[PDB]
Design a protein around this ligand. Structure first.
Ligand SMILES: Nc1ncnc2c1ncn2[C@@H]1O[C@H](COP(=O)(O)OP(=O)(O)OP(=O)(O)O)[C@@H](O)[C@H]1O
Ligand SMILES: [Mg+2]
Lengths: 49, 57, 150, 177, 116, 49, 69, 116
């Protein structure tokens, strides 16, 4: 058949677009997480001392 | 018994300007909206009535 | 005037008759069946189709509500009780009794795995006590209030 | 055969006609061979190559549907593209002459309407046009006589746009610089 | 069907409902695969509204008497217009799924609502 | 306190100016549209003649 | 023949914002419209065909165009 | 295009250019989303080298003089391959962007860069 092929093509294209967007958003969030995590070192070092 | 009425006056003065200007702006925009709405409603009603009477004639 | 669709995927799924209720249809309608059957059984195909659609839609859903869970349970029971094996003749009175029992929620408490066997139990017990009920159907082709209450 | 025998095409999709755009003309496939050789100088100057803007607008808005944190310039470009798309619509049985088309395109391109909420732009635009036709007639005469947009006419049009936008509201609106 | 000979409210309601159904048809595959939990608030609201509307267009007719015991029901035009405006505004979203299936009139909808 | 009463007179003056200008513009638009609609009705009248 | 033609340079208006903003049309240029069922091709054609009332109203035939359907 | 026909240096230069262009195209996504600031020193320098090479590849034409007034010119293959071998290390990264549009050999372009 023909219609099923077109439907699967459209679905796969939409899925690819959504996954690419999600990957880019996660890559963006990585930097903020890395900036946030490294802010507790001085207090920990001083309390240990 | 006199040096607190002065801080009360200062507190009132610190907000009188903002209150007055806000009230003035609000009244101005209210009257502008009313005038524009009246003019547009008059134009639309006149156009509709004119079209109706033109169709009748 | 009517056709029945049979799919191999349903056959391997576990439904021995393997009829697809979504597409199968009869043009004559309910005029052919006896009146008691139409009184007890009615609009079941809509329920089955909506159940299949909801199962397809919410197969991944994060959470289920009270109505959704109730519909899922009811449809699961209704599909499970419909399975029938080969070379198992059945009469109309037994069919109407089973359909009424299924459609009036008297088997909701029983778990799914025991839905079938339990039914095969009850139909035996009636065959020796309160059997006159069946006789009444054979003379009336309908159910009364006293028979249903009993 | 007929595509290969002629030049220039205008594809008319049905998905676009289903919702939103009434003309429903596809943009990424349509092409004209003659191009600028068949244009008016004034509107060619006013065009400002919005094709690339629309292309990157749709490309980015595919991504930014679920994205709330973006670059400020990216957000500005997305808003400009959405405003242009919402502007480009038009009802039926209503032809437009050249001068009002040029005026509307100039209004769209320079970013004057970027402060207008996208839900009620069209009506506002229409009103402006009507007002421009009522209390002003020099700009139409100039564009008809010289087929070019002058800087002084641009300044006068900017003043008219500012004074009109100062006194227009649709829903909890706010006139801004 | 154009506002030249028909009231504009009809045109607006038709355009709104067509747009909603088109958007739902577009989001179908993502909803099926990645699930409703992935979409945003606007998409979820439009999905719920689309489900409500799609269920609401059903109606029983007298010719169904031979097949189903439900009797016939008929509704005028203005009531349907007002009901569709109410539904597209989004003030009936609190009702369950089965309350919008095989409904003739608004009073019948309320009666079925009180029956669950 | 002395300055508090300066702006209201200007506000009233501009309100009256806005009222008169909008009345004038509305009158102009209404009389115009009536004019061309009547002219078009007459024109189709001799067209049908 | 091929030795009796000039280059194309003329603003043939169409009355549609999108059409003349994206894909210009000039005199002597063949333009194609391909569409799916129930899209609105005839509406665009009719708008273009009646856009020339003001052009006809002018005196000399330099702006006049005689159209056929 | 074979190493055994046009010399090994030609093949090496072609492979290096292809690799650099592919890396630039791959990193275009992170350039768009986060910019070159987050990129490492190696990443930033390779991005600059790639864009400078892309700008350098262009060459003025004969017919271009009909709109720019500058006739085109030709270069022997040896000079081009040696110039690209020198550029492989990205030494000219401190030169201005506008100076990288070629009009001919390397000597005249270097002189014009010093003439900016
Ligand atoms: N700009 C517009 N705004 C609103 N409605 C429009 C617009 N353009 C077209 N329509 C409507 O779209 C429909 C198009 O009808 P039309 O006569 O143009 O047919 P068509 O789509 O070209 O198809 P065909 O020639 O196959 O019948 C009509 O209902 C018309 O009113
Ligand atoms: Mg048509």
């Amino acid at each position: 058949t023909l219609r099923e092929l077109r439907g699967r093509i459209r679905s796969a294209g939409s899925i690819k677009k959504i996954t690419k967007a999600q990957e880019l958003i996660a890559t963006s969030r990585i930097a903020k997480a890395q900036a946030r995590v490294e802010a507790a070192r001085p207090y920990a070092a001083e309390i240990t001392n | 018994a006199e040096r607190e009425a002065m801080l009360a006056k200062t507190a009132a003065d610190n907000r009188k300007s903002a209150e007055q200007v806000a009230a003035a702006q609000a009244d101005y925009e209210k009257e502008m909206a009313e005038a524009r709405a009246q003019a547009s409603a008059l134009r639309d009603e006149a156009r509709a009535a004119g079209r109706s009477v033109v169709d009748e004639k | 005037d009517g056709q029945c669709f049979l799919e191999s995927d349903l056959f391997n799924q576990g439904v021995r008759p393997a009829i697809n209720v979504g597409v199968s249809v009869s043009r004559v309608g309910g005029a052919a069946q006896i009146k008691a059957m139409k009184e007890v059984a009615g609009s079941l195909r809509l329920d089955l189709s909506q159940y299949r659609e909801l199962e397809a839609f919410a197969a991944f859903a994060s959470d289920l509500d009270a109505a959704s869970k109730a519909q899922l349970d009811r449809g699961a029971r209704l599909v499970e009780l419909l399975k029938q094996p080969q070379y198992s003749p059945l009469a109309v009175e037994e069919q109407v009794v089973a359909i009424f029992l299924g459609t009036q929620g008297h088997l909701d408490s029983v778990p799914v795995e025991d839905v079938q066997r339990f039914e095969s139990e009850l139909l035996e017990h009636v065959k020796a006590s309160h059997s006159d009920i069946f006789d009444g159907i054979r003379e009336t082709k309908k159910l009364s209030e006293e028979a249903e209450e009993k | 055969n007929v595509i290969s025998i002629t030049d220039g095409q205008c594809f008319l999709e049905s998905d676009l006609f289903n919702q939103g755009v009434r003309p429903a003309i596809n943009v990424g496939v349509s092409v004209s061979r003659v191009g600028g050789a068949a244009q008016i100088k004034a509107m060619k100057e006013v065009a400002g190559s919005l094709r690339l803007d629309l292309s990157q607008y749709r490309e980015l808005e595919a991504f930014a549907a679920f994205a709330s944190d973006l670059d400020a310039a990216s957000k500005a470009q997305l808003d400009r593209g959405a405003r242009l798309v919402e502007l480009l619509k038009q009802p039926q049985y209503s032809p437009l002459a050249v001068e009002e088309q040029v005026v509307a395109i100039f209004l769209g391109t320079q970013g004057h309407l970027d402060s207008v909420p996208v839900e009620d732009v069209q009506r506002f635009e229409s009103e402006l046009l009507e007002h421009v036709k009522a209390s002003h007639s020099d700009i139409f005469d100039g564009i008809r006589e010289t087929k070019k947009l002058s800087e002084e006419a641009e300044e006068k049009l900017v003043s008219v746009i500012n004074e009109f936008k100062k006194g227009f509201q649709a829903s909890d609106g706010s006139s801004v610089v | 069907l154009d506002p030249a000979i028909v009231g504009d409210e009809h045109y607006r309601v038709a355009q709104e409902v067509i747009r909603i159904l088109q958007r739902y048809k577009d989001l179908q595959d993502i909803i099926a695969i990645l699930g409703i939990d992935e979409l945003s608030e606007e998409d979820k609201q439009l999905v719920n509204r689309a489900r409500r509307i799609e269920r609401f267009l059903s109606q029983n007719m007298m010719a169904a008497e031979q097949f189903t015991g439900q009797p016939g029901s008929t509704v005028p035009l203005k009531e349907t217009i007002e009901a569709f405006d109410k539904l597209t505004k989004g003030e009936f979203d609190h009702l369950p799924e089965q309350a919008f299936f095989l409904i003739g009139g608004l009073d019948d909808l309320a009666k079925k609502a009180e029956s669950l | 306190l002395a300055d508090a009463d300066a702006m209201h007179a200007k506000a009233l003056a501009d309100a009256k100016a806005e009222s008169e200008k909008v009345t004038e513009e509305a009158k102009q638009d209404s009389e115009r549209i009536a004019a061309q609609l009547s002219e078009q009705a007459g024109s189709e009248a001799e067209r049908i003649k | 023949s091929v030795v009796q033609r000039q280059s194309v340079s003329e603003p043939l208006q169409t009355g549609i914002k999108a059409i003349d903003a994206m894909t210009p049309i000039g005199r002597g240029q063949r333009q194609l419209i391909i569409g799916d069922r129930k899209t609105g091709k005839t509406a665009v054609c009719v708008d273009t065909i009646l856009n020339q009332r003001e052009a006809w109203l002018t005196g000399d035939p330099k702006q006049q165009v005689r159209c056929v359907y």
